Amino acid sequence: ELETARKQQQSLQPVALSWEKYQKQERQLADWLTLESLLPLWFAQQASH
Q: What is the C-alpha radius of gyration for the chain, rounded to an integer number of angstroms? A: 22
Specify the DSSP class assigned to residue 19: H
Taking the C-alpha atoms of residue 12 and residue 9, their distance in angstroms, rounded to an integer, is 5
DSSP string over 31-43: HHHHHHHHHHHHH
Q: What is the resolution of this structure in A?
A: 3.7
Query: Which method resolved this structure?
Result: cryo-EM
For 18, what's the count of Cα atoms within 13 Å in the CB-facing half-sphere? 5
